[PDB]
Design a protein around this ligand. Structure first.
Ligand code: 9UE
Ligand code: 9UE
Ligand code: 9UE
Ligand code: ADP
Ligand code: ADP
Ligand code: ADP
Ligand code: MG
Ligand code: MG
Ligand code: MG
Lengths: 371, 371, 371
């Protein structure tokens, strides 16, 4: 019949059906355990909570993420997140529907092999595939040529694609992160005397940056003017109706993506990583990549991100280049939309790995590479 | 001439002169008010008492601490504690001597700015500086490389330092506390029927843990043997000569530092916080940090603390590491000794903020960071 | 008196005195700057570190190489590397001794002119010369005829020489590299989940390939057998005593020299480049070149390199040729030894450019070509 399309990352699950316009389930990739006691098992409160249940009952729980930096670090909790995805949120038996699954570009091979083993053995699925976030993100724009830049909760990566050919050699990946921006915002907020210690408070700091942070177009002038004018300062009201006021932290937090030395990394910013990835491509490609830069995933969504990115790339590139950066408003769903398209496309249908073909071939078969 | 060095925390003041071997004044950071009546102002008993006066006349007073978790929460009483430090205990006019002042690593900026404003305006001081407890604590050992772990009345923090470079990114701070161990010991003592309600009784429970508590090397075996044998049980005699007998509470109280879930926090223990802070450092540094772990402040002083800390770190680290933990007996004065050294060091002498330079620059100047 | 002989490349400096058997100083061509802060200049830790200092204090620094692909890309750091060579490591005043200097075969002319200008103006040297790595490498073997193949950190080049005549027309150069093998090994290691991001980790991956990599004699059979048998898998212990296990990556990395399509280049391998360079020589020479193939520089030093090189050339050449490939164990020092010999040789002594002769002639004189 029809095929499930699943995009699961360090910050969310996005799952649904091929050919829908948007995901049906979006929920945090979180499992929570009772913190203050071992369970009153005879009365039988749930021993664990997943997604929006764990976000509702936040304060009593400790919130774990099964996926660190795009790598599944706890399989016991990742089987809970897939079970909760299929049975509770989609209301689907996975026995009927093939599934489409997603990874970051450069990733331990066992992270794919164990995911495949679990999806055939603990769940039963007619056929499966694993796809790259950047390829799907490009199909979501419909373009055949461009350099995708994709930044999620756990990873930032770049993949150049030219005329529908794809280049393994110029892939770049950073572990600079949405999380790695949250953890910086916790520290920088501490400068005002707001201390956010627990993981449940970390979810408050995440929501604070999602509402309030933006990319300063010119950082040094906005730092200068924020000291002089309180006009930048803006208010947030906590779950218990206390109130918070935030100043230069508001733009200073997204600055870490352009200057990771703030968090303390050796890295190029996302702009210098994009320019260096373009320059590693052959000189004929480079004009056509400068004509397309494409942004996907939530960390891209800060206000003014593309205006700064263009302002900094224009200063690096030769001045005779047209430099163009592309954002739909839909960017956070772009990878899932690309997977929906690819799964629906009849041309794809031979690429599914059949369970029998896995059974004879053994786990290595998943790594076979296809366009 | 010579420079005052002041280390003031949630549990004590340690003050004295640069180049002395130890503080000259040590007294509780306490202000006490008459509890049972308003003063007979015409007869004119003192309306407030500070430090050892308030500890001598304990029962009639209510004892307040101006500093909560390293943050000065009452300035009216903190000006009383500085006035009582300089005029009554040191017998010094602060008009002549520059002063050196100390904070926890991550702290509201206004807590430093208001302290500086008060020290120039309400008291007159030729020059001032603010220093970090971990840096001073490392100078007190003389080492150039190590991970300091410093635990006071109000805060626990870690700062890695390598070859005299210092790393802002890997600082960690807990609000687990000497106080937060006292308040647990009050509860755990209640299990035997000794109820300590008032702040004056809280000072008795503090002195009980200071005399009697120790860190159980292996907790579960000592819990098992304490139930069987009364040999662990030991006697304390109260101010009025009544007597108290205390069993497994004696080690169970310091266990909270290793397992803060006892008090009810989400935290790593001090061992897992130290190991995680080492692991956030680059792999070359990590061997040299494992070779040095340094302990400062009174909460470190429980018997067997370092033997347990080493036993638990050795189980976390790769087994080929030499793991070394360092305690002088002097640890409670270590921060003050480090400040004495730093103030005496001629290299430092340009780092003082002159009152005129503050007057022109305004309060922000205090945050400039220096070695 | 006596003459300094200097061989400086993208991966090392090899320097010493003419007529010695080996270099006196060998140290990385690295300059390191404090990464976590700008220096605390008043306390005055060194603002930069060079060679083995930068390798000792690796974790706190960011490591730059001044030379990319045999071209000096940062002169500010290259003057630091020459200063550290003469004053700190050799303990020599360059005012007294003439120096002998080395380049890759085809290289920007300004790279020679600026080096000469610096060596007369910022350092004072009685006379200078620039020499080709392949010529020196051949003098180190003492042969008069052969095709040298020289592979360093940054460049691979070939020069045919016949009866002590040298042929400009058949020089070939590749930017396939020791570095370009390290950067591939970082990626291929990522397949096992070991991520090496920083330049200090890049030095660990360099040391991993230097200890563990080897040239697979037949690649496809060893790929087949490595999957079946764990016997190839071998262990490496990190700076912090963690352990690493490496399988088919161990030979797959040196395979890139034979098949640069792995890294993604259009190139012949070193074998097909050598065969094509021989074939560009006149048919009488070609037998005498097949009788001598000579290997110099560290990238040549992988185990089994010559056995594979001979096995692949023997399959290309006419079967009636004796095909002979020559490796001392000393190959990494071979260029320096050849320069030591050439500088000591009295016949050479007229070829030095005197400082006065440079002063009158102007910079172009350096390019005059001499045997
Ligand atoms: C409701 C919240 C905050 C507050 C009640 C909201 C109000 C509005 O903030 C203030 O401005 C008040 C004040 C404060 C006090 C002095 C000052 O010069 C500036 C601020 N600061 C505080 O009460 C600090 C003190 C503190 C602890 Br201990 N360690 C810390 C580590 C670093 C910094 C500061 C601290 N404090 C106890 C908290 O944040 C607690 C843990 N925070 C929360 O539970 C979350 C859910 C947010
Ligand atoms: C766009 C192009 C050139 C450049 C960017 C255009 C600019 C304008 O040329 C310069 O003048 C800059 C600079 C340079 C550096 C120092 C110097 O005293 C003179 C020039 N030289 C370089 O970046 C060299 C260095 C180099 C490699 Br590795 N091996 C080589 C072998 C021989 C010579 C030099 C080299 N370099 C990396 C390239 O050429 C690359 C491969 N070239 C190209 O992709 C083509 C399509 C043309
Ligand atoms: C000491 C070292 C490695 C390790 C601790 C040594 C141990 C022995 O390796 C493992 O086998 C464990 C594990 C792992 C987890 C799951 C799995 O199916 C296989 C391995 N992988 C990891 O912890 C990865 C995860 C990762 C980050 Br984030 N981005 C990445 C990009 C690509 C791939 C993987 C990753 N990780 C955090 C690291 O490597 C860190 C950055 N590495 C280092 O600091 C250097 C100095 C080497
Ligand atoms: N509107 C927004 N503005 C700013 N940041 C956002 C926004 N929406 C999500 N984010 C951040 O982006 C990350 C989630 O991105 P996403 O691509 O959904 O992650 P994943 O790829 O794991 O699903 C989180 O760090 C979240 O805080
Ligand atoms: N010998 C000891 N044994 C156990 N606890 C102690 C000892 N000495 C001090 N303490 C406790 O440690 C805290 C004082 O630590 P200290 O570092 O002096 O605080 P501060 O940093 O405020 O000066 C108090 O809670 C005190 O009860
Ligand atoms: N024993 C070895 N085995 C494998 N590779 C080596 C060995 N020794 C050095 N190398 C590599 O060769 C390069 C150094 O070669 P070298 O000729 O000394 O460079 P340079 O010409 O710059 O001095 C580096 O990439 C180093 O990793
Ligand atoms: Mg994503
Ligand atoms: Mg202290
Ligand atoms: Mg060389």
């Amino acid at each position: 019949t029809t095929a499930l399309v699943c995009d699961n990352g360090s910050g969310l699950v996005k799952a649904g059906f091929a050919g829908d316009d948007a995901p049906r389930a979006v929920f945090p990739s979180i499992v929570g355990r009772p913190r203050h006691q071992g369970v009153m098992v005879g009365m039988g409160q749930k021993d664990s909570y997943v997604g929006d249940e764990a976000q509702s009952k936040r304060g009593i729980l400790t919130l774990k993420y099964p996926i660190e930096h795009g790598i599944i670090t706890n399989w016991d909790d990742m089987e809970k997140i897939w079970h909760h995805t299929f049975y509770n949120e989609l209301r689907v038996a996975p026995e009927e529907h093939p599934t489409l699954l997603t990874e970051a570009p450069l990733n331990p091979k066992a992270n794919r092999e164990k995911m495949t083993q679990i999806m055939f053995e603990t769940f039963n699925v007619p056929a499966m595939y694993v796809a790259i976030q950047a390829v799907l993100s490009l199909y979501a724009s419909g373009r055949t040529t461009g350099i995708v830049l994709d930044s999620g909760d756990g990873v930032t990566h770049n993949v150049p694609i030219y005329e529908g050919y794809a280049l393994p050699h110029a892939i770049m990946r950073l572990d600079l992160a949405g999380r790695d921006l949250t953890d910086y915002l916790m520290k920088i907020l501490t400068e005002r005397g707001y201390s956010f210690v627990t993981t449940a408070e970390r979810e408050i700091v995440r929501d604070i940056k999602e509402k309030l942070c933006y990319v300063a177009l010119d950082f040094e002038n906005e730092m200068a003017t924020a000291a002089s004018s309180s006009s930048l300062e803006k208010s947030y009201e906590l779950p218990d109706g206390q109130v918070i006021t935030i100043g230069n932290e508001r733009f200073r937090c997204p600055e870490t993506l352009f200057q990771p030395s703030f968090i303390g990394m050796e890295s190029a910013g996302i702009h210098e990583t994009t320019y260096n990835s373009i320059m590693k491509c052959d000189i004929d490609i480079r004009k056509d990549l400068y004509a397309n830069n494409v942004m996907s995933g939530g960390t891209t969504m800060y206000p003014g991100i593309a205006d700064r990115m263009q302002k900094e790339i224009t200063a690096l590139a030769p001045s005779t280049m047209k430099i163009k950066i592309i954002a739909p408003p839909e960017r956070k769903y772009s990878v899932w939309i690309g997977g929906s398209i690819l799964a629906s496309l009849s041309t794809f249908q031979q690429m599914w790995i059949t369970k029998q073909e896995y059974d004879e071939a053994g786990p290595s078969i998943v790594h076979r590479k296809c366009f």
